[PDB]
């Protein structure tokens, strides 16, 4: 249906400060075409273990039962747009 942006972050993760603002850019670009699921790893440890989160930030892009891409590090809004387009075009 629509692309899920599963985003694991923490307040102690330095790169997540900019990652969070980059996610703001992404949402502005896509609107309701993208759904940001912003997850505080410290508040969701079991969910984190489920997706085998070992680094922050971790960004997982999903659409209709299939995972498009996963990044275990900072990714700019522009680069996120690129591989979304790369995987869906
Ligand atoms: Cl949890």
Swiss-Prot record:
Keyword DNA damage listed: no
Top-rank taxon, per record: Eukaryota
Post-translational modification summary for this protein: The disulfide bond between Cys-13 and Cys-16 acts as a redox-active center and is reduced by thioredoxin reductase TRXR.
Intrachain S-S bonds = 13-16
What membrane topology is given? Peripheral membrane protein
Q: Which GO terms describe its cellular component?
A: cytoplasm; membrane; mitochondrion; PTEX complex; symbiont-containing vacuole; symbiont-containing vacuole membrane
Name all Thioredoxin domain ranges. 1-88
Q: Which UniProt keywords apply?
A: Disulfide bond, Electron transport, Membrane, Redox-active center, Signal, Transport
A GO molecular function annotation here is:
protein-disulfide reductase activity
Active site, renumbered? 13, 16
Subcellular compartments: Parasitophorous vacuole membrane
Binding partners and assembly: Monomer. Component of the Plasmodium translocon of exported proteins (PTEX) complex composed of HSP101, EXP2, PTEX150, PTEX88 and TRX2.
**Family affiliation:** Belongs to the thioredoxin family.
Function, as annotated: Participates in various redox reactions through the reversible oxidation of its active center dithiol to a disulfide and catalyzes dithiol-disulfide exchange reactions. As part of the translocon PTEX complex, plays a role in the export of parasite proteins into the host erythrocyte. The translocon PTEX complex is a multi-protein machinery resident in the parasite parasitophorous vacuolar membrane, responsible for protein secretion into host cells.
Recorded protein name is: Thioredoxin 2
Q: Which organism is it from?
A: Plasmodium falciparum (isolate 3D7)
Task: Give the stretch of the parent protein shown, with its full length.
Answer: 70 to 157 of 157
């Amino acid at each position: 249906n629509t692309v899920i942006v599963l985003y694991f972050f923490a307040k102690w993760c330095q790169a997540c400060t900019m990652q969070s603002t980059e996610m703001d850019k992404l949402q502005k670009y896509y609107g309701k075409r993208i759904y940001l699921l912003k997850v505080d790893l410290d508040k969701n440890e079991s969910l984190a273990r489920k997706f085998s989160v070992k680094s922050l930030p971790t960004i997982i892009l999903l659409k209709n039962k299939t995972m498009l891409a996963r990044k275990d590090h900072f990714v700019s809004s522009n680069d996120l747009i690129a591989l979304i387009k790369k995987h869906l075009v």
